[PDB]
């Protein structure tokens, strides 16, 4: 069991292309897959000097950019056992060290940045 948060950037081709974050609940997502990848890359890389991030630092990007319903709790996914989420998410998530933020990783849901709380 490890504790993760995430930022989710959706695109038009996901199964539910609408934001579920409080900031813009119901906003239809029309950006391309490529657009989502580029956006996730930018929101991460604007802080690329960071070896690790504090929780507050990661929650800032959740508040500004995440389109997942988890944004209603600042992107908290709680405790996750390996093998539960899709393989793409799981492998990247369980490769993180404490305080690290992943590179953009894609699943059916969209493009994620994954943060390991500890």
Author numbering: 266 to 383
Study authors write:
Recently, the nuclear protein TbPar42 (molecular mass of 42 kDa) has been identified, of which RNAi-induced knockdown in procyclic cells of T. brucei inhibits proliferation of the parasite, suggesting a key role of the protein in cell growth. Protein sequence alignment identified TbPar42 as a two-domain protein, exhibiting an N-terminal flanked forkhead association (FHA) domain and a putative peptidyl-prolyl-cis/trans-isomerase (PPIase) domain connected by a linker region. FHA domains are generally known as phosphopeptide recognition modules, although the TbPar42 FHA domain has not yet been proven to have affinity to phosphorylated substrates. Peptidyl-prolyl cis/trans isomerases are enzymes that accelerate the adjustment of the equilibrium of Xaa–Pro (Xaa being any amino acid) moieties within substrates.
The PPIase adopts a globular fold, which is characteristic for parvulin type proteins. The central β-sheet, composed of four antiparallel β-strands (β3-β4-β1-β2), is surrounded by four α-helices. A comparison of both structures indicates that well-conserved residues of Pin1-like parvulins, e.g., the histidine motif (His59 and His157 in hPin1; His271 and His377 in TbPar42), as well as a characteristic cysteine within the catalytic cleft (Cys113 in hPin1; Cys333 in TbPar42), are located at the same spatial positions within both folds. The hPin1 Ser154, described as a part of the catalytic tetrad is replaced by Leu374 in TbPar42. Residues Leu122, Met130, and Phe134 of Pin1, which are located at the concave side of the β-sheet core, constitute a hydrophobic binding pocket for the substrate’s proline ring moiety. At the same spatial positions, Leu342 and Phe354 can be found in the TbPar42-PPIase structure, whereas the methionine is exchanged by a tyrosine (Tyr350), Figure 3D. A homologous loop is also present in the structure of TbPar42-PPIase. Although the PPIase domain of TbPar42 adopts a parvulin fold and reflects structural elements of Pin1-type proteins, it is catalytically inactive. From all the current data, we may conclude that the PPIase domain of TbPar42 seems to have no enzymatic function within the protein. Residues affected by peptide addition were in near proximity to the proposed proline binding site (Thr265, Gly334, Val345, Thr349, Glu352, Gly353, Phe359 Glu373), but KD values were in the millimolar range (~10 mM). Thus, the structural reason for the absence of activity remains unknown.
